[PDB]
Design a protein around this ligand. Structure first.
Ligand SMILES: [Cl-]
Ligand SMILES: [Cl-]
Ligand SMILES: [Cl-]
Ligand SMILES: [Cl-]
Ligand SMILES: [Cl-]
Ligand SMILES: [Cl-]
Lengths: 275, 277, 278, 276
């Protein structure tokens, strides 16, 4: 179906872009990966931005639009273990805010040491019985205020931190994951702990492979005009805008993504007015 | 007293910059002219010296020093203090068409600007004035399409005239009031003179940045920032001095966009502080 | 000394329009603004205290003191993001006035919004997509916002994560070094107090009137200076004869440049009549 | 069908025009009936506001609406002399900006002492050979800036001011007015001066006779709620609002009328939002 404006993503950028687009009565459509404003649950696997209108190819439906706001965020990197692929959506996940509610009063683990890992551990503490953060280094690379919150819960709450350790194998059966094999990288001593689910939070790349060859990109990030003269979210293709983490490899905060999401909606409004 | 980070302002940008700075345990100080912690100082900075380290800020009686400065003084509509106004106030020069526009019934007036405010004032004055001449420095108008269409309809079939790529150089008049304007085409540099009974300045919210004149690179009162995709997007021409919110944004001007750059400024400042000693 | 027949406080459409009309009546008005024949004088100063109990009225500036026979208050209204109660101790750690600034830090947490205007409703709606639950707290029995937004709010209150507590005010924000964890509220009609658990509170009152210096001397309601209004003249007069108020300081409904200009004009004409009969 | 509208505004002075702007900004597609904005030139001679929708009767067409903004202003007041009615549109007028151009290089008079009289005398000075302002009091009840303009022209221009005097009779013949009989109210001495035309500018009464019996009124002015709680322009009938000089007998400035016109549009918007 055809729409004046389609927004890809539902993080702070996508959501803020929809609010502003809706306030301008553009009747935006948000297409978000399965897991006024109209919300469509679909996953775009291909796009054609060389002609007007722009074409988006979903699982079964095809969409067309006059303007496109890309706010797909980032997607988790995986360790690459066979037991990781093998237990996907069955004890292995890379999105605590997606699947974390299924582990109420259960023991879970988080693998990583950046902001994503710390934020996921903190988010899972309010749901899980216990949260075990596993990281290969001796220190964490996150904001100080979040580290202090984490350490407070590690000393007096339901969080355990295992330093200088890597995930060797995810163990489980037909019903799902039930254990993890870990190894201390400094001592090479292996252990085995019981876990109902593990959350991989080790690194994030922008979700932009489908735009390869059509949009100017650098290290996977969609290039935007930026600047102080307006049209700051516009890509090399007029009418195609990018906001949030897909076009920001420095700040990566919900508030900065919300800001560019707003900008994208206003940029799109101006493009539609002059069509 | 000396501080690692001082934030000037009290809007979404200043507030968001303080939150992030506080989360990084920088103990930020917010100096506002209103009258993991944050300190709030109620004072008005009337002068600054950003040429040496540390930066100096001059308040009403007390002086402050800092290693980094986040300018987020915002923008506010001015109704008083426009050029040539004091001599011609309510007698030819105004910034409020809905205030004294009614005194120009069957008279020729001008409106200076190209945003929503300028277009709306020109449209409002058309129902009163004999003719309305909209004067703008750019080639296009930065307003909603519905308002542009209304304006163009009156320009084609009404009493509205549009002079593009032009700026107001001087307001000419005498004891009884304004009677002419000196204008200049910014592309050709050719100056002209048109007869007008009154002029209406419609630029909207202007940035609060007069104290930084001569030290920070500015354009139309807005503090220039690096912007871009390689970090330090809120940095001014002086390293360690950052600007966020409406003082450095003349396009979007939303609370959420100001909050975004405020956050960016705090993170840019954090990086500058980490690499100092 | 620094005496004037008419002094106007403010720099918005009301103050400006009041000056024009006062000047046209040759009252030689003085506009005192806190920024930085038939004439108007502009003084750049900030009034921090006033004494309106005697004639002439006294205004205290940074260094100069002024006296006047009539006073037109047109100080407007501005959004405050800083200086809310209990904020200084809990800033960016439980107390805020900008949901779009730090709302994202309350994902899957219980939060509250204080207010009943467009700002409060919009912040509650914005926070619903982030927070576990949003509790809107308002002192009145009805909401003073656009109907389309009220319907959105009520839809989420009936089928979503929004709860509404009417006829209630925030008495105290409770918490510790790590942040806010509770709120003390009071029902203004029954005076019964309660205590609810909250991870963060968002104060959403909008543009508030700049009138704290007139507390105790001028009749006010929710910070707005009460004016006589009506159809019999002296519509901008406060409880003190010779003291008038115009613009957003005395209007919590329309808040347009043209409506403020109208009352600013009215204030100048009301002041002119007061001066003629002195 | 097509004769029905969500909002109809009666009048085109500052109140009516400001109400239309705001109504249009709220996408109400307002219609202005004056005697995305639509302008209709018609005169309403009867209204029925007792039922929904409200009915308005024009010269030939009938209109219906969900909300009504009355901003009909005021119309010139006349002394009530027989010779005044008798020379209407033939030497007697109450609108200098209407008929003043027909007295180029002729002697004219203006009767009154308020802003209207002063402004008409000043307007007529640029056209007429001479302008004689006649007023019953010793001083003028107008803005000081306008009085100074008038007095400057009275001392160095073509304006003459006759104080403490009233118009007793308008004298003329088949071709029109040619003289006026005036009397000094303090001395009772009468005089006779030659004039080609006289302009009555003594006051303005509200244009509201068609609303008699349906809307609460006082001395012809439509009563409005006023106040500080909103709906300040609402009459005794919900959905019917009044703005400008029709509901203001004190201030009467273009800017005050513009203000209430804005208020009326916002009040009407709220009434329409809650209709369903
Ligand atoms: Cl000047
Ligand atoms: Cl510009
Ligand atoms: Cl410049
Ligand atoms: Cl002020
Ligand atoms: Cl002083
Ligand atoms: Cl005639």
């Amino acid at each position: 179906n055809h729409h004046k404006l389609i927004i890809l993503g539902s993080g702070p950028a996508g959501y803020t872009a929809a609010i502003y687009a809706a306030r301008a009565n553009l009747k935006p459509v948000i297409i978000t990966g399965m897991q006024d404003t109209q919300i469509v649950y679909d996953t775009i696997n291909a796009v054609d931005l060389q002609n007007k209108p722009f074409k988006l190819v979903g699982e079964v439906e095809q969409y067309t639009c006059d303007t496109l706001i890309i706010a797909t965020g980032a997607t988790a990197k995986y360790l690459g273990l066979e037991s990781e692929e093998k237990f996907m959506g069955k004890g292995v996940s890379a999105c605590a805010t997606c699947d974390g509610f299924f582990y109420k009063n259960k023991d879970v683990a988080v693998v990583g040491g950046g902001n994503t890992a710390v934020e996921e551990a903190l988010f899972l503490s309010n749901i899980a019985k216990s949260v075990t953060l596993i990281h290969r280094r001796d220190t964490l690379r996150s904001e100080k205020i979040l580290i202090d919150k984490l350490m407070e819960k590690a000393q007096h709450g339901n969080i355990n931190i295992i330093w200088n350790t890597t995930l060797e194998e995810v163990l489980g059966d037909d019903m799902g994951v039930n254990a993890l094999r870990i190894k201390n990288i400094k001592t090479n001593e292996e252990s085995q702990m019981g876990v109902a689910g593990v959350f991989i939070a080790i690194g994030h790349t922008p979700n932009t492979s489908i735009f390869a060859g059509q949009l100017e990109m650098e290290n996977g990030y969609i290039k935007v005009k930026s600047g102080l003269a307006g049209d700051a979210t516009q890509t090399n293709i007029k009418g195609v805008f990018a906001a949030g983490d897909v076009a920001d490899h420095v700040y990566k905060q919900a508030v900065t993504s919300a800001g560019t999401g707003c900008m994208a909606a206003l940029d799109a409004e101006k493009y539609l007015d002059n069509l």
